[PDB]
Design a protein around this nucleic acid. Structure first.
Length: 206
DNA sequence: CCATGCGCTGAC
DNA sequence: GTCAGCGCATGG
């Protein structure tokens, strides 16, 4: 298996692979955190991210998307998500993702000199993003391939609070799973939704 | 030890 | 559709 700080595609996991739950995506190594949208280390970079419609400032255009950093929220009361109530900061996961950009870390944001030389990020799209994106899968989670950070910057989001934004652009030879070519490949590879052991059983009875 | 957290399940 | 809160993994 690969280390937790592995950059790039996970061997044996082609674009198009699908998992019903986040813990399954974690177990595969594609996106380790089972909750966080970003998996990264503040002195290395981000290895992967998940688009799940969790942040109102995200803009999903398929091969291109504007991702929002995490944080800027009050999670007291043992919460995992909430609306924006404070300015986000270029720290922890947010800092890791900015490091993927082919440019020195910049507190005011930056643009890549040559975006193709930036560190790769494995991208997963979750069905919940389907509320505003036509690229989200109908069910579960789907690995969509490698993307790179073209630029990142801070600005006031819909809430009026400062949020960090990142422009990601796809850089993968495997076809996008939402195109005719991607669907054909998924079919040819016989990829199907992965469910936990005995999940469907208990699911039906519910 | 402690902060973070783009989930998930059940009760309206 | 809202919404309250819990275990756990990862990073530091």
């Amino acid at each position: 298996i690969v280390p937790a700080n592995h950059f790039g595609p996970i061997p044996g996991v082609p674009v198009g692979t699908m998992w019903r739950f986040r813990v399954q995506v974690s177990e595969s190594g594609v996106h380790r955190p089972h909750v966080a949208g970003i998996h990264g280390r503040s002195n290395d970079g981000a290895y992967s991210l998940v688009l799940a419609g969790g942040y109102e400032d995200d803009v999903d255009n398929g091969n291109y998307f504007t991702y929002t950093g995490s944080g800027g929220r009050d999670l007291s009361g043992n919460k995992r998500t909430a609306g924006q109530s404070s300015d986000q900061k270029l720290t922890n996961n947010n800092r890791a993702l900015a490091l993927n950009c082919h440019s020195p870390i910049n507190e005011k944001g930056a643009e890549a000199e040559d975006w193709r030389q930036g560190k790769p990020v494995r991208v997963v799209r979750n069905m919940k993003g389907g509320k505003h994106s036509k690229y989200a899968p109908a069910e579960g989670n789907r690995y969509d391939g490698i993307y790179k950070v073209v630029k990142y910057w801070p600005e006031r989001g819909k809430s009026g609070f400062l949020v960090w934004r990142y422009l990601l652009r796809r850089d993968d030879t495997e076809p996008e799973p939402w195109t005719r070519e991607g669907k054909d490949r998924t079919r040819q590879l016989g990829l199907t939704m992965q469910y936990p052991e005995g999940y469907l059983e208990a699911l039906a009875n519910k």
